Enzyme design. Structure first.
Site, PDB file in Angstrom:
ATOM      1  N   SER A 121       0.763  -1.215   0.000  1.00 46.17           N
ATOM      2  CA  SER A 121       0.000   0.000   0.000  1.00 46.17           C
ATOM      3  C   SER A 121       0.819   1.304   0.000  1.00 46.17           C
ATOM      4  O   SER A 121       0.255   2.375  -0.222  1.00 46.17           O
ATOM      5  CB  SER A 121      -1.019   0.027   1.131  1.00 46.17           C
ATOM      6  OG  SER A 121      -2.127  -0.836   0.822  1.00 46.17           O
ATOM      7  N   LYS A 165      -0.039   3.326  -3.020  1.00 48.16           N
ATOM      8  CA  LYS A 165      -1.232   4.189  -3.073  1.00 48.16           C
ATOM      9  C   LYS A 165      -0.828   5.632  -3.306  1.00 48.16           C
ATOM     10  O   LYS A 165      -1.568   6.386  -3.891  1.00 48.16           O
ATOM     11  CB  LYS A 165      -2.106   4.085  -1.800  1.00 48.16           C
ATOM     12  CG  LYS A 165      -2.798   2.742  -1.672  1.00 48.16           C
ATOM     13  CD  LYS A 165      -3.804   2.742  -0.476  1.00 48.16           C
ATOM     14  CE  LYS A 165      -4.829   1.563  -0.540  1.00 48.16           C
ATOM     15  NZ  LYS A 165      -4.125   0.311  -0.603  1.00 48.16           N
ATOM     16  N   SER A 181      -5.908   2.184   4.257  1.00 45.49           N
ATOM     17  CA  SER A 181      -5.271   1.249   3.330  1.00 45.49           C
ATOM     18  C   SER A 181      -6.267   0.330   2.653  1.00 45.49           C
ATOM     19  O   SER A 181      -6.001  -0.887   2.485  1.00 45.49           O
ATOM     20  CB  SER A 181      -4.162   0.388   3.944  1.00 45.49           C
ATOM     21  OG  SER A 181      -3.175   1.148   4.576  1.00 45.49           O
ATOM     22  N   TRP A 225       2.079  -3.361   3.947  1.00 42.54           N
ATOM     23  CA  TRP A 225       2.313  -4.704   4.447  1.00 42.54           C
ATOM     24  C   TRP A 225       2.023  -5.641   3.290  1.00 42.54           C
ATOM     25  O   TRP A 225       0.862  -5.803   2.891  1.00 42.54           O
ATOM     26  CB  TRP A 225       1.431  -4.994   5.645  1.00 42.54           C
ATOM     27  CG  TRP A 225       1.688  -6.294   6.329  1.00 42.54           C
ATOM     28  CD1 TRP A 225       2.466  -7.364   5.909  1.00 42.54           C
ATOM     29  CD2 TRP A 225       1.020  -6.739   7.524  1.00 42.54           C
ATOM     30  NE1 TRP A 225       2.345  -8.400   6.830  1.00 42.54           N
ATOM     31  CE2 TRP A 225       1.489  -8.030   7.823  1.00 42.54           C
ATOM     32  CE3 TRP A 225       0.120  -6.137   8.389  1.00 42.54           C
ATOM     33  CZ2 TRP A 225       1.018  -8.761   8.917  1.00 42.54           C
ATOM     34  CZ3 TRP A 225      -0.285  -6.816   9.490  1.00 42.54           C
ATOM     35  CH2 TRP A 225       0.129  -8.134   9.733  1.00 42.54           C
ATOM     36  N   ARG A 255       5.959  -1.090  12.941  1.00 39.43           N
ATOM     37  CA  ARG A 255       6.450  -0.207  11.895  1.00 39.43           C
ATOM     38  C   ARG A 255       6.498   1.231  12.394  1.00 39.43           C
ATOM     39  O   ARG A 255       7.538   1.901  12.326  1.00 39.43           O
ATOM     40  CB  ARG A 255       5.590  -0.353  10.641  1.00 39.43           C
ATOM     41  CG  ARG A 255       5.684  -1.738   9.988  1.00 39.43           C
ATOM     42  CD  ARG A 255       4.593  -2.020   8.966  1.00 39.43           C
ATOM     43  NE  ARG A 255       3.297  -2.019   9.602  1.00 39.43           N
ATOM     44  CZ  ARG A 255       2.141  -1.953   8.955  1.00 39.43           C
ATOM     45  NH1 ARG A 255       2.104  -1.933   7.628  1.00 39.43           N
ATOM     46  NH2 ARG A 255       1.005  -1.928   9.643  1.00 39.43           N
TER      47      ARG A 255
END
Length: 240
Positions: free
Chosen positions: A46, A49, A93, A186, A226
């Site tokens: 993602s 995006k 996401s 991810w 993360r």
């Protein structure tokens, strides 16, 4: 040396391997417990995006205020089963919204634009709605940090209006006078799995510091890792 050593240990403490690339100006610095990841290609997941939105906005395949409607087909998460703007879907996401956008753009335009901008290996293959999830499109963490730095500075090859619009979608929070912008990723449909957090900080006097965290998402690693590692690292570096 001590900053680097500390950040290495942040990755060790979560029992995986990863890298954090930092960009200020035209140079980059890599930190972590597997520095070779910085120049290794991974699926963007993602994180793509960001570019999908730039292409879609620039080419009038989306606006920032339209809703991408849910058609009632089961989605991967119930949170996604609602109408969403591109910005809502960015924050969530929400893969299917961005699949719809990709299909609006189409394979020919998508391929041309990904190549134009030189994103990663710029290889989207033949399937316009999953090339960022399962391949063939791949990108390194150094490339991601550079992408983020250019977006932050509005120097990607798009209008400044569209870049500003995408920046707004990416805003996370203001912390200690710093504005933080980021996009997580991810890649869970590849093996090994990849985790990302790519973004930038705008410091109080305007200085931009871009980053890309990239690590291996093993079984048992919470997705919160993360953001936690990124923030702790940026604090240790004096960025936050």
């Amino acid at each position: 040396d001590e900053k680097a050593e500390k950040i290495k240990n942040l990755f060790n403490e979560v029992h995986t391997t990863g890298v954090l690339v930092i960009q200020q100006g035209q140079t980059q610095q890599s930190y972590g417990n597997d520095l070779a990841r910085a120049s290794t290609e991974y699926v963007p997941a993602s994180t793509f995006k960001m570019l999908n939105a730039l292409i879609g906005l620039e080419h009038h395949k989306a606006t920032t205020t339209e809703v991408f409607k849910w058609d009632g087909q089961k989605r991967l998460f119930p949170e996604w089963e609602k109408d969403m703007t591109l910005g809502d879907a960015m924050k969530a996401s929400a893969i299917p919204v961005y699949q719809d956008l990709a299909r609006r753009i189409g394979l020919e335009l998508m391929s041309k634009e990904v190549k134009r901008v030189g994103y990663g290996n710029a290889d989207i293959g033949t399937q316009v709605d999953n090339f960022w999830l399962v391949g063939p499109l791949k990108i390194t963490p150094q490339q991601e940090a550079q992408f983020a730095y250019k977006l932050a500075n509005k120097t990607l090859p798009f209008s400044p209006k569209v870049q500003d619009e995408v920046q707004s979608m990416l805003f996370i929070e203001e912390k200690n006078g710093n504005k933080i912008y980021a996009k997580s990723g991810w890649g869970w449909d590849v093996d090994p799995q990849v985790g990302w957090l790519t973004g930038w900080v705008v410091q109080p006097q305007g200085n931009i510091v871009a980053f890309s965290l990239n690590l291996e998402m093993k079984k048992g690693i919470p997705s919160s890792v993360r953001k936690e590692i990124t923030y702790k690292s940026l604090e240790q570096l004096g960025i936050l």
